[PDB]
Amino acid sequence: ENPHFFVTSELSVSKLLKLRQALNSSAEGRYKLSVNDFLIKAIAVACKRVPAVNSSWRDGVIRQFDTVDVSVAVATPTGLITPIVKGVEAKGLETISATVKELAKKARDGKLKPEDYQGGTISISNMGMNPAVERFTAIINPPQAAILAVGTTKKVAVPVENEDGTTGVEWDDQIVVTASFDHKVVDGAVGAEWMRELKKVVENPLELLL
Amino acid sequence: ENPHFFVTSELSVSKLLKLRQALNSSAEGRYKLSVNDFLIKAIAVACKRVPAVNSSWRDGVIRQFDTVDVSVAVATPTGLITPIVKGVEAKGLETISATVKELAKKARDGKLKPEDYQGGTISISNMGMNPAVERFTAIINPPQAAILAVGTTKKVAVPVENEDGTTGVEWDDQIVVTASFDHKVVDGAVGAEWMRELKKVVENPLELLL
Amino acid sequence: ENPHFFVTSELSVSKLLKLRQALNSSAEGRYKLSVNDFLIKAIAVACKRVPAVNSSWRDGVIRQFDTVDVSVAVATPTGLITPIVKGVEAKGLETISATVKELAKKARDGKLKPEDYQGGTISISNMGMNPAVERFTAIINPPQAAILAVGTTKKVAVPVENEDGTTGVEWDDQIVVTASFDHKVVDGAVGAEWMRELKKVVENPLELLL
Amino acid sequence: ENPHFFVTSELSVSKLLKLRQALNSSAEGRYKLSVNDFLIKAIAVACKRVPAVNSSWRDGVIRQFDTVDVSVAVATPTGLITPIVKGVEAKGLETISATVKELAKKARDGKLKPEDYQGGTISISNMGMNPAVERFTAIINPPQAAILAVGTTKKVAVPVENEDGTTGVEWDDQIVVTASFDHKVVDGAVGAEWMRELKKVVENPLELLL
16 A cells, blocks of 8 residues: 655764763663664754654545654564654653663563554654664555664774875774654655764764754 | 852863754754853753742742743843743753854843743853853752753863773863752752752753754 | 851862872772761861860850861752761771761761751861862851861972972972851951961871871 | 842962062052052052942932042941052052051041031942952942952962963962942942952952053
């Protein structure tokens, strides 16, 4: 029913990894941030910058949402459930990480209420904990217009300019992301622009601070 | 009427200055962050951690506020006005800087509405643009329980341990801050704790990211 | 009601720290002296040398006291209480330290009798255990005429004359103290003289032995 | 009754000390200038540049004064008296020093007439002769709008750029000054501007010549 199209990007996470390390060292056990928390915040910023992706199909209309409620895919013994982080734009990374850990526990325990997993405006699915999944596509969760699939981290050789003008080799830690879009709502231009903003914010994570 | 007491701290801003420089260079003219925007955000975080400072005196009761609406003192040709940044906890630094510049312009133009300057929960007054004001006290703006006065930046000699075990001299850029508190509401212990959290967050500005 | 004025001094504690270390090492667990015990004794000596500070306002008269009963501010979960060390001039440092620890425990336990905290002739408040409080003012505890606020210890670069006639840098451990005085009773001259005697005795702690 | 607020500045006196030395050496006993005479003249110049500080509260009106009559606080065995140097703008430093010494003697002798100490437009209190008073606040002498408290001189390490681009240490002789202002008459902006002019004139004492 949905004309799926896929847009893929490689993202450098070296700076994000350094930032995560510094923050987790400074947390004194109050929280433990994952890469997923940073990706969720960057998604929320990008959705605020390109609201057309923050929308849903309805009969005859596109419902654009003013809030970004991110449904996070959690595998359970009974399979996939999508608890919802509401109002992500207004939450700090600590609150996001804590909420996600709590909700994922409730998910595994089967104690989620319908309001915990009914609704949401965009989904994220992160399987990067499995080293055999470098890239995958995810099926859109209707009625959302977009889903971001996030693969595992791998080291990739990248060219570095040496001071002598030779090109050396640096090893960049990259993840592959693939956005699946519903072509009724989001065309290729909007999706590519949103992917550009996501890349920009993730590779310069100080923009996550604005 | 108010038993004023004062608590003073020296704050290292070297790291904050570096961060401000990097962000302003990356802004591409979209925004121009000042030190004041960082201090406002750090204040909002500290007020969220110690809500007893985020309160107001009323006849017979302390009204504690769930939101931190920061009144920012702006000098005008007609003197002092206090436009209010509402909901600071949920705003990014870009939105804060833009809002403050807009409101300060409206203030100078005399086009502020009463709702722009009536209310607020805590005040900040920043005179650090004048190099002859290293330290000052500010008079509390009733009914708020606290006001932070922020002086100018000066270089101070600080001891540094050299690799040889000698103590060298480093030059730390420090500001002096002075909080004035209403002793009916906030005692010395709460004020000192809040000053500790402010210092901690400003000197480790990555905590401003949480 | 009280015309508060403030007099501030930086005090070298390097010698006091060395003396405290030697005494605590020699105590064999009988006692454990804090800097606060030394400051209390020095206060008692200074109050004996300048009795005009050792006085209280009454309707029409200044009641000068022959004894120095020092009220020590202790933070409790219910806030501030002021247990009284009576007859400080006649007590040794061991007795002072033991009494203060016992009374502070009773304070936290809420087991102080009125006679333990009603009265006193001068107060001390010591917040130097918080590294974010370099300087503060304390509100006078009526009817006492004076209160000494004691901030935290910091290292300060001080000039030292080298044997070659060059000026090197030494690192002096300094505390900031601020006396608040009631200008009805104590004028600036008496307060400055008393601050001079306090500085003299603290920086030459052998005078605490006389 | 008076909303007191305090503005503090560190002032370099190295150049003023050199100038005082040269002048006193050239006086051949005709006069003996103190630092206080220079501060009085600089105050008079600053008051002429910012007359709003040179004013007094009256019921319903601010009386701005065209002349600067500086009341100088003198400690006596009976305490504080404020003899008045009239028309300071038109007097040279020699006349100021001579008048101050004469009036201070009459003060100690109790031979001041009411006209010698009734009135005045601004006060100065100088306790810098006591090395234990680095900083203090003074209570405003009504109906004057401002009082300047002047602490003692201390040596402070300041950064100096060496010819090799290293940062050495220089020892600057600094005094701390604290102006107390009545917030009904003088707001923070005017007080900070006046403090700026005072600093400018004291640090570049050739401007005292204009």
